[PDB]
Amino acid sequence: IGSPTNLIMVTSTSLMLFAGRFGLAPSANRKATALEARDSGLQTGDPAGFTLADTLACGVVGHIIGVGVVLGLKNIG
Amino acid sequence: MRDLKTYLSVAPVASTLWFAALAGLLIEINRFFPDALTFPFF
Amino acid sequence: WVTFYWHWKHITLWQGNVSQFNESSTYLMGWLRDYLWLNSSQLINGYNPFGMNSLSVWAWMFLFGHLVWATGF
Amino acid sequence: PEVKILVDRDPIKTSFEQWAKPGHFSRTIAKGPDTTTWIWNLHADAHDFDSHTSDLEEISRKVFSAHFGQLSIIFLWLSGMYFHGARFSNYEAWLNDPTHIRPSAQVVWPIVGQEILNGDVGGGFRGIQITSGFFQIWRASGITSELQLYCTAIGALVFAALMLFAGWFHYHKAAPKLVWFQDVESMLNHHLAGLLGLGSLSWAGHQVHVSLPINQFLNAGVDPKEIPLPHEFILNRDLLAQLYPSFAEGATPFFTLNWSKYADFLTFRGGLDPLTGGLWLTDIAHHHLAIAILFLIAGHMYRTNWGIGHGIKDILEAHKGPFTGQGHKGLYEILTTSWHAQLSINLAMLGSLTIIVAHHMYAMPPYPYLATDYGTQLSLFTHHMWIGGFLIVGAAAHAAIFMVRDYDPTTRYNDLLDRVLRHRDAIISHLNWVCIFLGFHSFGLYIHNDTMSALGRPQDMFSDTAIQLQPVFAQWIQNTHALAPGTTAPGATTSTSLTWGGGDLVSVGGKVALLPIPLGTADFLVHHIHAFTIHVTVLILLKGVLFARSSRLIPDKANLGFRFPCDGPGRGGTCQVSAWDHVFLGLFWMYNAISVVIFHFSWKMQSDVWGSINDQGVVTHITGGNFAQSSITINGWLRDFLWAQASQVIQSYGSSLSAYGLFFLGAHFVWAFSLMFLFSGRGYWQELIESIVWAHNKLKVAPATQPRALSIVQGRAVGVTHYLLGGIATTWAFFLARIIAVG
Amino acid sequence: RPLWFASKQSLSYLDGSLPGDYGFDPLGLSDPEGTGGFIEPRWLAYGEVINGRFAMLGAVGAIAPEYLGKVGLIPQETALAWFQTGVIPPAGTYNYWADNYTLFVLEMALMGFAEHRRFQDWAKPGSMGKQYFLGLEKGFGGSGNPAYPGGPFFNPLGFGKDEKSLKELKLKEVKNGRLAMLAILGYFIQGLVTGVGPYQNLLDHVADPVNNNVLTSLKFH
Amino acid sequence: TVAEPDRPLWFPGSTPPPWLDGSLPGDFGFDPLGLGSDPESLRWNVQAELVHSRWAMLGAAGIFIPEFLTKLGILNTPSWYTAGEQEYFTDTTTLFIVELVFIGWAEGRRWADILNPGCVNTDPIFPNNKLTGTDVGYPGGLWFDPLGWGSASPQKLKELRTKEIKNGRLAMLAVMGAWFQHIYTGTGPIDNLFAHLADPGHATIFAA
Numbered sequence A: 001i002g003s004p005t006n007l008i009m010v011t012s013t014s015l016m017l018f019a020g021r022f023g024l025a026p027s028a029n030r031k032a033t034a035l036e037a038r039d040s041g042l043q044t045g046d047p048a049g050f051t052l053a054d055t056l057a058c059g060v061v062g063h064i065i066g067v068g069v070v071l072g073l074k075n076i077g
Numbered sequence B: 001m002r003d004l005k006t007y008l009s010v011a012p013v014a015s016t017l018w019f020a021a022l023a024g025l026l027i028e029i030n031r032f033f034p035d036a037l038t039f040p041f042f
Numbered sequence C: 001w002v003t004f005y006w007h008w009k010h011i012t013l014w015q016g017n018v019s020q021f022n023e024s025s026t027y028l029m030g031w032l033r034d035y036l037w038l039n040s041s042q043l044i045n046g047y048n049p050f051g052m053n054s055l056s057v058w059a060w061m062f063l064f065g066h067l068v069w070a071t072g073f
Numbered sequence D: 001p002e003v004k005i006l007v008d009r010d011p012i013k014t015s016f017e018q019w020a021k022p023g024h025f026s027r028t029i030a031k032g033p034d035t036t037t038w039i040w041n042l043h044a045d046a047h048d049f050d051s052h053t054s055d056l057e058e059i060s061r062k063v064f065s066a067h068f069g070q071l072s073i074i075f076l077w078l079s080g081m082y083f084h085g086a087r088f089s090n091y092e093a094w095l096n097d098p099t100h101i102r103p104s105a106q107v108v109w110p111i112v113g114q115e116i117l118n119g120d121v122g123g124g125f126r127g128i129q130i131t132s133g134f135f136q137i138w139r140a141s142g143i144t145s146e147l148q149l150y151c152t153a154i155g156a157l158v159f160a161a162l163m164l165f166a167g168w169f170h171y172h173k174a175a176p177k178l179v180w181f182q183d184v185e186s187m188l189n190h191h192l193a194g195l196l197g198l199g200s201l202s203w204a205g206h207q208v209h210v211s212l213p214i215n216q217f218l219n220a221g222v223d224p225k226e227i228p229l230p231h232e233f234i235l236n237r238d239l240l241a242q243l244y245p246s247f248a249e250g251a252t253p254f255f256t257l258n259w260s261k262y263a264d265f266l267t268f269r270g271g272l273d274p275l276t277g278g279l280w281l282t283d284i285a286h287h288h289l290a291i292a293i294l295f296l297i298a299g300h301m302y303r304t305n306w307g308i309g310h311g312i313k314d315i316l317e318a319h320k321g322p323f324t325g326q327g328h329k330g331l332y333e334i335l336t337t338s339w340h341a342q343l344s345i346n347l348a349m350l351g352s353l354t355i356i357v358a359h360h361m362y363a364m365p366p367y368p369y370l371a372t373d374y375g376t377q378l379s380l381f382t383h384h385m386w387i388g389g390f391l392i393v394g395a396a397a398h399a400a401i402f403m404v405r406d407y408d409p410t411t412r413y414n415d416l417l418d419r420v421l422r423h424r425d426a427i428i429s430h431l432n433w434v435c436i437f438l439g440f441h442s443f444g445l446y447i448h449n450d451t452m453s454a455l456g457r458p459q460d461m462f463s464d465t466a467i468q469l470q471p472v473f474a475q476w477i478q479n480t481h482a483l484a485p486g487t488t489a490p491g492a493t494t495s496t497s498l499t500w501g502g503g504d505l506v507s508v509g510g511k512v513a514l515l516p517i518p519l520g521t522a523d524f525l526v527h528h529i530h531a532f533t534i535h536v537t538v539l540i541l542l543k544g545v546l547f548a549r550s551s552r553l554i555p556d557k558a559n560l561g562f563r564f565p566c567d568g569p570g571r572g573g574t575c576q577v578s579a580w581d582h583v584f585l586g587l588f589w590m591y592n593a594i595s596v597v598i599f600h601f602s603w604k605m606q607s608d609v610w611g612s613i614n615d616q617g618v619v620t621h622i623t624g625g626n627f628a629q630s631s632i633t634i635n636g637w638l639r640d641f642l643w644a645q646a647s648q649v650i651q652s653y654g655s656s657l658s659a660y661g662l663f664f665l666g667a668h669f670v671w672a673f674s675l676m677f678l679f680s681g682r683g684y685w686q687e688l689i690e691s692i693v694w695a696h697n698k699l700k701v702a703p704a705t706q707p708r709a710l711s712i713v714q715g716r717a718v719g720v721t722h723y724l725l726g727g728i729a730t731t732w733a734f735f736l737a738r739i740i741a742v743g
Numbered sequence E: 001r002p003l004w005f006a007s008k009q010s011l012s013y014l015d016g017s018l019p020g021d022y023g024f025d026p027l028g029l030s031d032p033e034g035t036g037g038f039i040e041p042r043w044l045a046y047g048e049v050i051n052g053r054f055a056m057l058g059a060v061g062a063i064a065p066e067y068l069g070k071v072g073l074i075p076q077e078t079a080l081a082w083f084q085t086g087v088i089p090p091a092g093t094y095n096y097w098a099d100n101y102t103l104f105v106l107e108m109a110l111m112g113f114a115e116h117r118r119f120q121d122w123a124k125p126g127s128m129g130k131q132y133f134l135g136l137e138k139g140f141g142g143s144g145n146p147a148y149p150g151g152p153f154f155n156p157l158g159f160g161k162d163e164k165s166l167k168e169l170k171l172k173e174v175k176n177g178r179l180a181m182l183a184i185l186g187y188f189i190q191g192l193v194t195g196v197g198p199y200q201n202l203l204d205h206v207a208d209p210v211n212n213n214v215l216t217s218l219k220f221h
Numbered sequence F: 001t002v003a004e005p006d007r008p009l010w011f012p013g014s015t016p017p018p019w020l021d022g023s024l025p026g027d028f029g030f031d032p033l034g035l036g037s038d039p040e041s042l043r044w045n046v047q048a049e050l051v052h053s054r055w056a057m058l059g060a061a062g063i064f065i066p067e068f069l070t071k072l073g074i075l076n077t078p079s080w081y082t083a084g085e086q087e088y089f090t091d092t093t094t095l096f097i098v099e100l101v102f103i104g105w106a107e108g109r110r111w112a113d114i115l116n117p118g119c120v121n122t123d124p125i126f127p128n129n130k131l132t133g134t135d136v137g138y139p140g141g142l143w144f145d146p147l148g149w150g151s152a153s154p155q156k157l158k159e160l161r162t163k164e165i166k167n168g169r170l171a172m173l174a175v176m177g178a179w180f181q182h183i184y185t186g187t188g189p190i191d192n193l194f195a196h197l198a199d200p201g202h203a204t205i206f207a208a
């Protein structure tokens, strides 16, 4: 650890991971319009259809939110 | 091989070879006999 | 070509500078630089940001022709 | 719907058999010539693939391999430039003393007298001064020795070989399937994130590890041979740390989001480095990093094999409204079917881009010692303007080829296109009107000023001293840019460009680099000239596209093709109704527009920008600030621009610039030569040729390939080609002699 | 049939018959639909095998002289890291009986013969046991399977005489190779960031696992 | 004149081109660019390879043997590379014109033989002399085959002609070898040989 940046990074990260994980985020098996269900064809041991492609996606999104927020927190106060 | 010699006989290629030879010749002649408004040997 | 020839030979004769034609008429840059370019000097200044003179009617007309000619294209 | 690698093996056999059969691609041309017209058609149809075959897969394979051929040629050309930089350049001497030495990368042989073109460029070097700009690039890249240029030339040659090989490979061995090409989401995802993103990131890497430090030692006056090699900055981080201390951290601030600590070599200062007159390399590396992130993000927008992301067809179809009907419905099918459509959009955007580049490179000189090298700057701006304009006229040509060849409402319909076609008369009539209004109220103002000045009424002119037409809007804009740093861009230290912000004149070697560019009635009038010329070009080309199918004069025009001379003397006469002839006509107007643009650039930059500066700071501009009072009149353009600034090129004989005098006259010659073709017609020429042919048969020397006058269309194409070459090369010689002598 | 990150594409062709099959091709590289050069699934299997074997040899020989140099009978003049061997001159060099370039020409000659003939068994099986090669031809006729030619030279002891043991040993060779490739990759990245050699790096992690070069991310030669 | 289908090829496993059936001496199936693809050009190039081979064997002798002996305490002969600059009993140009005349005669008659086989076998002065060869490139006769080793059975002539062509290929490579060596190194070829024999691991291409 060694910073409050860790808290915001695991915050935005784990929050987006949780979003894409169960529901209320366009997962690989959930296509959005303006969240319809669809098949990726890519199997996953996780029973809820949360795949590896969506794992990488939600992680990177949690890092975009997290780095943007921490740089918005440090460059303000 | 026969087809390649045929291609090398085609108008533009034969023209580049021919005029390239002619250019090298005229260049070298003007290199050993530069300037010259006249035929000096009479 | 005829009139360029006549006018340049005479305009050099009238200036006592016949040599300028004799040496400069053997290459085309000589015609472009020492006839047209050189003798446009007073013409194109017939009017300018600093005033006018009697040559303005010839400056104007000079462009008029340039325009009409180009319109023809 | 599962994106994947798809090719076919050995579609076309590698053989010289069809090398020996001219016109093999065409069933008619392959029969060989009965007349000389054959010889021209063979060359006009060589790259018209969709006329050779109707199979989209074959066409796509030809296109792909052809692109490989192009890239091979480009790499061979870059290999040439770097090799000449290593072997026939004064680049090291210039690298020592840039503000004095003139860059020269070509040396001529002493054969016929031409060695005079090897002029004194400094550094004990005789040669031709180059205006391409490679010295400023190589310096900005940290390149010091000729050896590094050798290595780059060898790598470039190798890549030429690789590209050529891949062309042969993907046409003759592994040729992609049609579905492979049509995977548009995959292609856009890989060009956004893979090509542009990883390219920009890689370049940021080279800059932070090579360009920034080596340029620090160059700017600190260190001798280039004494500068550490670029990899010594990668090995011993103490060299960089001495130059840039942040490198002592070990990229830990990057992962810990302490990125502000990198403000050392990643900066948002803006403006120009006053030593080099180019943009801050810290700002540039930071820039390439940001761009890299943006494109790497943009490359995940489109769905491929994992369900996340967008289908482009979905996006198109959702966009429709009460004015446009079902619009955008059908465009995915058109843009994945017609090559000419894609080439049309890409030519439009790539040319427009090239023009934007032309502006941004002068107003924000990106390389060191580039701004003060006026020959290189004028050459670059003019060059990229020409490329842009040509590319845009091409975009019109291929929009027209789409309309004639690939448009089919019974199969691939689009509502927007149909509606446009359904009020083409309104569109073209209104564009026509705007063009007339702009002609009068831009050029007619010039005629007003010439007439008032000739009559001795300068107070009745349109001038900053008489009837002022101030560009109030643009002035307000550049003021807002001047005020931006610290206010609406608190991170920006200085103005975005020195053309905006008042003061902060930048001078290098006594010559100015950039200062605030004034704007007045002269600039107003010229800008409306640019508006006018662009609108007329758009009129000709757009009219060509929208009436390519049909018109009230010719209802079946699309059946006559994209490129045809006419439909005869009837209906009053129908010459030049083809969309091709609209491209022909639009080329002249692109020439007109771009010509006035580059004249405006040279005139304005020499009058109000470029010049020398005193030790006490008194600036003398190359021309005496005479733009404001002399450009507002056509006579002023004839006299104070053309007649004045042509003295160098007509006085170049006997110097190393005499080649520009020769090209001046020769380009005049080919331009006048074009008028023979543009003003006449092939019937006269064919009759004359009948008499000449008689003379040959008299002596048993008439050829079997019967001589024919050029086609009507070829007459036009020859004509416009020589017109453009002559005019453009004339301005070329004029510009280069002028700015090399007085710059 | 344990499956790892399979897809409908992958299971469409990955049949389980290929040694080491876990049905894993998320990019569909072994998809048999489009097949040209080097995207043939057979070629990718033979390639995984060859890369795997070479990677076994390299994974061993890269860390061996360093370890033996720690405590062993090897002279410390010759006991180096894999990257300081003279492979990468800026990382380090050693003066052998040759100039390292003559060594390279030599090795490209020997590997020239071995690899060229190997390929000829791939392109025309059994063609390397026909033309006169000063004998040796018989073992160069191959088994009809390029990755597994066997014969007297390459399989003298004939392990896996039954298909079951040969298939298990093939699964073993595949997983061994997949492990060794990741190994030599690890040598690359470790020696890149750490710079002390792979085994010395591991030891930096042994007495102090709290070292953990991940968070450090520092690099020196 | 004997097809040889299973002959050892240059590229084991590869298929020989159809215009190389093994009948020619020295046929290892090597013509990847199809330079002898048509029969006419293969005929011509067979004569070419033969003449190049013989000239290159004489040249390999003239370089390597005198350089080797003069390297010892036997001869004083100068370096083959610089032997042209030497001053002989007359100027080299007139020697060269002599050479062009006589060699021009020989090459001219060989030329007439290639273009019109057999038409050139008679002495234009003493007709009873004549030449025995029936194959182009192997003229025979008392002058060119006095020991008669050239007129023999097939398979023997194929063995010997194969020997000639392989020796000649080696000699071509060797002559150009001493050339590029003397340009690259600064000595004669025998010094390259000895310098390499002393330290073959180092004294190579890469000692410079």
Ligand code: CLA
Binding pocket: D063, D064, D067, D068, D071, D180, D181, D183, D186, D187, D190, D191, D193, D194, D195
């Ligand atoms: C990150 C992957 C990637 C990259 C970097 C590129 C890069 C490029 N593509 Mg490609 N393409 C890709 C994936 C990619 N493509 C995909 C997924 C598709 C859809 C299936 C396409 C289909 C496509 C078509 C149809 C065409 C291109 C073209 C081009 C060239 C455009 C001109 C240019 O910018 O020159 C800049 C030059 C360089 C950056 C030099 C570097 C180029 C290196 C050598 C290639 C690196 C990427 C390459 C694909 C790696 C594969 C090699 C391997 C299989 C042996 C360019 C080099 C055009 C082309 O083929 O031009 C010949 C073109 O017609 N692309």
Ligand code: CLA
Binding pocket: C067, C070, C071, C072, C073, D431, D432, D433, D435, D436, D437, D438, D439, D440, D443, D444, D447, D536, D539, D540, D585, D588, D589
């Ligand atoms: C200098 C030569 C010249 C001139 C004057 C023009 C003029 C014009 N062209 Mg043309 N063109 C030219 C060269 C020229 N062209 C050439 C060489 C080509 C071959 C490539 C073309 C091909 C071409 C095409 C394909 C098109 C045009 C179009 C136009 C019109 C543009 C609209 C406009 O500006 O209206 C205003 C008029 C002017 C700016 C001319 C000057 C007006 C003066 C200053 C006003 C004086 C009025 C005064 C009261 C006169 C009364 C006096 C009394 C005694 C009668 C315009 C009238 C476009 C068009 O049709 O229009 C939309 C069109 O599509 N041109």
Ligand SMILES: CC(/C=C/C=C(C)/C=C/[C@@]12O[C@]1(C)C[C@@H](O)CC2(C)C)=C\C=C\C=C(C)\C=C\C=C(C)\C=C\[C@@]12O[C@]1(C)C[C@@H](O)CC2(C)C
Binding pocket: F030, F031, F032, F033, F034, F035, F052, F053, F055, F056, F057, F058, F059, F060, F061, F062, F063, F079, F080, F081, F083, F171, F172, F173, F175, F176
């Ligand atoms: C190497 C050479 C030719 C090489 C050709 C090659 C590899 C071509 C191969 C291929 O084309 C094929 C076949 C088939 C294609 O599908 C593929 C490729 C791969 C393209 C000729 C040498 C030919 C070499 C010759 C002929 C040398 C003759 C020497 C003479 C005459 C004597 C010279 C001297 O006299 C001097 C001048 C001075 C004296 O002091 C010394 C001496 C040496 C005595």
Ligand SMILES: CC1=C[C@H](O)CC(C)(C)[C@H]1/C=C/C(C)=C/C=C/C(C)=C/C=C/C=C(C)/C=C/C=C(C)/C=C/C1=C(C)C[C@H](O)CC1(C)C
Binding pocket: E024, E025, E026, E027, E028, E029, E050, E051, E052, E054, E055, E057, E058, E059, E060, E061, E062, E081, E082, E083, E085, E087, E181, E182, E184, E185
């Ligand atoms: C499959 C796939 C498909 C899907 O779809 C997707 C994905 C997943 C992406 C994919 C991919 C994956 C991966 C990762 C791969 C990788 C591989 C590798 C790594 C290899 C190596 C491999 C490797 C290798 C061979 C290596 C080898 C090595 C060696 C020999 C070494 C050597 C050496 C030694 C000893 C010592 C010295 O001193 C040095 C040297 C000289 C150096």
Ligand SMILES: CC1=C(/C=C/C(C)=C\C=C\C(C)=C\C=C\C=C(C)\C=C/C=C(C)/C=C/C2=C(C)CCCC2(C)C)C(C)(C)CCC1
Binding pocket: A013, A017, A055, A056, A057, A058, A059, A060, A063, A064, A067, D293
């Ligand atoms: C299975 C399991 C589980 C779960 C787990 C989890 C929850 C996971 C996850 C997750 C994760 C672990 C995530 C993370 C991630 C990351 C990522 C995905 C990355 C990213 C990246 C990138 C690419 C970045 C980029 C960037 C940005 C953002 C911007 C700027 C620049 C940079 C570069 C920085 C449990 C426990 C239940 C049980 C057991 C096992």
Ligand code: SF4
Binding pocket: D565, D566, D567, D568, D569, D570, D573, D574, D575, D576, D681, D712
């Ligand atoms: S003059 Fe020529 S272009 Fe005009 S209608 Fe007649 S044939 Fe057609």
Ligand SMILES: [Ca+2]
Binding pocket: D004, D005, D006, E028, E029, E030, E031, E032, E033, E034, E035, E039
């Ligand atoms: Ca495939």
